[PDB]
Amino acid sequence: SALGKLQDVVNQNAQALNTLVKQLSSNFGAISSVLNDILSRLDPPEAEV
Amino acid sequence: QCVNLTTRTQLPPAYTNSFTRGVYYPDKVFRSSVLHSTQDLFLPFFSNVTWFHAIHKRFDNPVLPFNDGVYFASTEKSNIIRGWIFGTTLDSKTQSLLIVNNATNVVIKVCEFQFCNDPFLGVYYMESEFRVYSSANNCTFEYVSQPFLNFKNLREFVFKNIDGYFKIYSKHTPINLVRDLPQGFSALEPLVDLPIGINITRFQTLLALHRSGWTAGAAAYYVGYLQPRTFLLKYNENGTITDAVDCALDPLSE
Amino acid sequence: FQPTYGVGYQPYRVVVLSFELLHAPATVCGPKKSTNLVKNKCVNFNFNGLTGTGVLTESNKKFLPFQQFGRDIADTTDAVRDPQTLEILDITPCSFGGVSVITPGTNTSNQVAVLYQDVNCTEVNVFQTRAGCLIGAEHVNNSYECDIPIGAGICASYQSIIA
Amino acid sequence: TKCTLKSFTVEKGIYQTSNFRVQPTESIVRFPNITNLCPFGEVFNATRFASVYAWNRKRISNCVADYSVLYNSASFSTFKCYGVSPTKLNDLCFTNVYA
Ligand SMILES: *[C@@H]1O[C@H](CO)[C@@H](O[C@@H]2O[C@H](CO)[C@@H](O)[C@H](O)[C@H]2NC(C)=O)[C@H](O)[C@H]1NC(C)=O
Ligand SMILES: *[C@@H]1O[C@H](CO)[C@@H](O)[C@H](O)[C@H]1NC(C)=O
Ligand SMILES: *[C@@H]1O[C@H](CO)[C@@H](O)[C@H](O)[C@H]1NC(C)=O
Ligand SMILES: *[C@@H]1O[C@H](CO)[C@@H](O)[C@H](O)[C@H]1NC(C)=O
Ligand SMILES: *[C@@H]1O[C@H](CO)[C@@H](O)[C@H](O)[C@H]1NC(C)=O
Ligand SMILES: *[C@@H]1O[C@H](CO)[C@@H](O)[C@H](O)[C@H]1NC(C)=O
Ligand SMILES: *[C@@H]1O[C@H](CO)[C@@H](O)[C@H](O)[C@H]1NC(C)=O
Ligand SMILES: *[C@@H]1O[C@H](CO)[C@@H](O)[C@H](O)[C@H]1NC(C)=O
Known part of the structure; x- marks a missing residue:
C-alpha cells in the first residue's frame, strides 16, 4: 500500500469509465436499451419517443 | 397397472446441509478470469436440503412441491433413480411431463397421463416391470434422446420452468463418500431446454425395485428449492466457474 | 373411381395445413438462411439473433x-462461436478515431497534415505513430524542440511539414 | 479546420476537427445447419390416404418446415393460403401445424 495515491487515481478513472460504459445497458424507462431493437420493432412515431 | 407398496417402514425424512452445491451456469455466455454478479433463481449456500433414502425397508416416493425450481442431488450406485414426473394435479385433468431413462433410452413426453399413486420401474434378478401411468390420451411434445446417466456416482440436476421453457441443468461427479453430500464446489452445465409450456407445481421421483416381495436398492437423493438471489461467480482462465459467493448469506459474503 | 373418368370425378388428394399458434413456445419455423463467413473485414454480423458490426477474426479463446x-x-460481446462450424471468433470493433489537422499559421503556409488517432495506416508521406497515422508529414531522424505536439514523443514542425 | 474554428485564419497548432469511422461492407447472417426437417414426405407422398369421413391428422411439431419446396412444386393443382401469404411462410414461426 505504499503507492496507494497513484492507484487511487487510476482506480477512480477506470471505475468512471466502467460506469459510463455500463450506463448504456440501462433503458431509462424505454422498452429496450438497444437502439437497433427499437428501430427494428417500432414505427418512427413511437421509436422517436 | 398400479401396485400399492405396503411393506414400507415409517420414518420421517431427513435434512442435511447444502454446503456450496447447486450452482449452475446462469447463461450461455463465455466469461474468462472475471468476477460476475448475477441475480437468478439459485440454491442458497448451507441451506436445509431434504434427504430421502432407499435402503433395506425405505422407499421414499412422496409428493413434493416444485415451487420456483428444484435442485435434485443423487448419491447413486447400481442405477435405481430413473426419472421424474412433473405436473399440477398428476392426473388426466391436467397435462403432465414424463422424463424416464429405462434400460434403452431417455424419453420425454408431455401427455395427460392418469398416473398411479406409486409409479415405479422394476429390475428382475433385466428390466421387465413398468407401472407409471394407466393411460395417455392427448400428447403434445415427444423427445427421445441420449442417456443422461458405497455410493460411487453423484448426479446433480436443476429443474426450472420460466416462460414456457423447462431448463434442465446437469453435472456428473465421481465420488467415494459413503453417506452424505460431499463438501465442495461444482458448477452445473446446462443439459437441455424443453419447450413444454405447461404449469408445474408438483413433481415425483421415479425409482426401480429389485426382485428376486420387493427389495429397494441402496440409493439416496436430496431435494432443495431455488430462491431468487444474487451470486458472485468467479470465472477462471478456462471459462469454468470455480468459486461462488452467496450475497445474502452473511455480512462477510455481502 | 375409374381411370376413364373426366375431370371433376377423378380422385383428388387434399392436404390441409392449419398453422395454429397457442401461447406455448413455438417450435415450427422456416429454414434459417445462412451465407458464407467472411473474416478480417468490418461486416454486420447476425449470429443466432445477436447482431452487431465488427471485424471477425480468429480467436484463441477455447x-x-x-x-x-x-x-x-x-x-460487450467480444467473442462468439460460429454455429455452422464450431470455431471461436473475436469481434474487434470497427476502427474509429479522431481526425486532427496539424498546420502552421495561415500567414506562414497553407500546408496541413492529417492525424487519424488510434487508426492503423493500412485502414485509411504516410507515417505510423503511437498516436495514430500521420499523413502529409515527412518523418525525419533528427531531433528538434517540440513546435506542434503530436503525442507519444512525436512533434511536428514547419521548415514542408516534418514530424 | 477554418469551419471548426469559425475563423479564416488558423493559428499554428493541432486541431481536432472531425472523426473517421470505418463503415461496414457486407452482412454475414450465420445460422445453424438446417437439420431435423419436418416429415412432409410422409404426409404428401404417402402410399395410402384416408377417406374424407375419417380424414387423417398428423401433428407437425418440434421441427423446421421448408414451405417453399411445396409452393414451388409443379405437381399441386390447387394451393390456396387463406390467413397467411404463401411466400411469408418461411419467416413466420407457428406453435404447431396440423396436416
Ligand atoms: C394405491 O393406494 C392409493 C391410496 O389409497 C389408491 O388410491 C385410491 O383408490 C381408491 C379406489 O377406489 C379411490 O376411491 C381413492 O379415491 C384413491 N385415492 C386417491 C388419493 O387417489 C390406489 O387406488 C391404490 N392402487 C390400487 C391399484 O388399488
Ligand atoms: C432442517 O429442518 C428441520 C425441520 O424442518 C429442522 O429440524 C432442522 O433443524 C433444520 N436444519 C437446519 C440446519 O436448520
Ligand atoms: C423404454 O421406453 C421406450 C418408450 O416407451 C420404449 O419404446 C422401450 O421399449 C423401453 N425399453 C424398455 C427396455 O422397456
Ligand atoms: C383430451 O382427451 C380426451 C379423451 O381422450 C378428449 O375427449 C379431449 O377432446 C382431448 N382434448 C384435447 C384438447 O385434445
Ligand atoms: C398453476 O397451478 C397452480 C396450482 O394448481 C395454480 O395456483 C395457478 O393458478 C396455475 N397457473 C395458472 C396460470 O393457471
Ligand atoms: C486451464 O487449462 C489448462 C490447460 O488447457 C490447465 O493447464 C490449467 O490448469 C487450467 N486452469 C485451471 C484453473 O484449471
Ligand atoms: C454443420 O456441417 C458441417 C459440415 O457440413 C459440420 O462440420 C458441422 O459440425 C455441422 N454443425 C454441427 C453443429 O454439427
Ligand atoms: C415426393 O417425391 C418427389 C420425388 O421424390 C419430390 O419431388 C416431392 O417433393 C416429394 N413430396 C414431398 C416431399 O412432399
Missing part, C-alpha cells in the same frame, strides 16, 4: 461446448 457468445468486464 469455449466450453455449451457456451456460444463471449463478454468482457464491460458486458
